[PDB]
Amino acid sequence: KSPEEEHPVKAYGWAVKDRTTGILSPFKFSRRATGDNDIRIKILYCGICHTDLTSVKNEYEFLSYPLVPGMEIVGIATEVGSKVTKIKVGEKVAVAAYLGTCGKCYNCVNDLENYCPEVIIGYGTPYHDGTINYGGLSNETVVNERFVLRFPEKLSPAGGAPLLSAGITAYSAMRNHGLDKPGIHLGVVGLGGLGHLAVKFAKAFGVRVTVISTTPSKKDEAINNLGADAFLFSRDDKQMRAAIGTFDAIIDTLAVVHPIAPLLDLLRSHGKLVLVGAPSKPLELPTIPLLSGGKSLIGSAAGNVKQTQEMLDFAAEHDITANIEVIPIDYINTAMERLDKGDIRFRFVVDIENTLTPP
């Protein structure tokens, strides 16, 4: 069938129609009717993350096109299924970075569902009904209540949107591995959308933070704007040899290939290097440092919906928001170009309600 015929309820947004160019354009489609456990969401803001860019750059083999990207959604519940009681129509809600899970593995039943082997990602893949999921650059969406969050009333809807993928990924990796207790000297490699949010949460956790980066012109943003206690330029072997053995843990946010040996030397014995960015190619692990130091390489991806709701409540109390540029949807293609060059501090957020036009 056609996108507008495939489902009963009409919907519209922007979508990459030709995967070889990556250009989004207005797109008409449809969404399933509200099930008994479903929430219909009028989308207000949609953050743009690196996953969107990679998708747009035609580097995701499995994705179906036309592709409606966007997986950091903030909106309003317009309709709720018969069985839904946690949310009422008219309340502010947010969507998790994933839309569903098998529901029968250990992870799912113990509320660690983001690690389910059969996790359904925000968009580009089939749902439990076989139909491709359309993401957040659209006027409305429908999501199972389990994967819909309650948005704190005292949190900027626009500024809170990037928390739903970038935020949770940093929050969960820190909480789950004990990088949230005051006293720790924590390194954050890479000052991007993910990196800048790792710094904000650490400061609100009371953690000493050195921003590790290549770009030396980010020093001012790292210290003055973000609140980093120190800054390491990753070319000055004087700085490097001085910091050897000084870090209890390091969060690596880099999406690009990069050496690992220098980062392990920066750790004290039994220190942990947490990888949360998805490198394009595989990196090379230096066994000699890992073994002699007794160090750990640890991967982390997003977080469970219970963590996501707890993180959202923790950001209202401590006024944690992202540094965002709110853009109209027809600026998306220019924004993608700027994101490809790192020409953003630090997060695009599309205003869906006011800049998306029906037809």
Residues that bind its own copies (CB under 8 A): 106-107, 112, 115, 117, 119, 245, 260, 268-270, 275-279, 282-301
Pick the closer one to Zn ion by CB: 106 or 282. 106
Q: Is 101 in the site for Zn ion (CB under 5 A)?
A: yes
Q: Is 276 in the site for Zn ion (CB under 5 A)?
A: no
Phi, psi of 106 (to 5 degrees): -55, -50
Report how far residue 258's alpha carbon sits from residue 323's, in angstroms, rounded to the nearest whole number: 26
Pick the closer one to its own copies by CB: 75 or 167. 167
Pick the closer one to Zn ion by CB: 105 or 223. 105
The listed partner (Zn ion, its own copies, none) that binds 182, CB under 5 to 8 Å by sort, is none
Tell me if 120 sits within 8 A of 98, measured CB to CB: yes
Contacts of 61 (CB under 8 A, 6+ apart): none
Report how far residue 152's alpha carbon sits from residue 310's, in angstroms, rounded to the nearest whole number: 10
The listed partner (Zn ion, its own copies, none) that binds 108, CB under 5 to 8 Å by sort, is Zn ion
> DSSP string spanning 66-87?
SB----EEEEEEEEE-TT--S-
Long-range residue pairs from 296-301, CB within 8 A, at least 24 positions apart, any chain: 296/270, 296/271, 296/272, 297/260, 297/273, 298/173, 298/177, 298/272, 298/273, 298/274, 299/274, 299/275, 300/169, 300/172, 300/173, 300/176, 300/177, 300/274, 300/275, 300/276, 301/114, 301/115, 301/169, 301/276
Pick the closer one to Zn ion by CB: 33 or 109. 109
Instruction: Please identify which residue in 11, 15, 71, 116 interacts with Zn ion, judged by CB under 5 A.
Output: 116
Pick the closer one to its own copies by CB: 32 or 177. 177
Position 77: which residue type? A
Pick the closer one to Zn ion by CB: 101 or 133. 101
The listed partner (its own copies, Zn ion, none) that binds 9, CB under 5 to 8 Å by sort, is none
Single out the residue of 66, 329, 342 nearest to residue 194, CA to CA.
Answer: 342
Q: Is 163 in the site for Zn ion (CB under 5 A)?
A: no
The site map against Zn ion for 53-92 (x = CB under 5 A) is: ----------------------------------------
Pick the closer one to Zn ion by CB: 36 or 111. 111
Q: Is 304 in the site for Zn ion (CB under 5 A)?
A: no
Q: Which stretch binds Zn ion (CB under 5 A): 25-33, 105-113, 190-198, 265-273?
A: 105-113
Shortest CB 69 distance to Zn ion, Å? 24
Tell me if 80 sits within 8 A of 41, measured CB to CB: no
Q: Which residues bind Zn ion (CB under 5 A)?
A: 101-102, 105, 108, 116
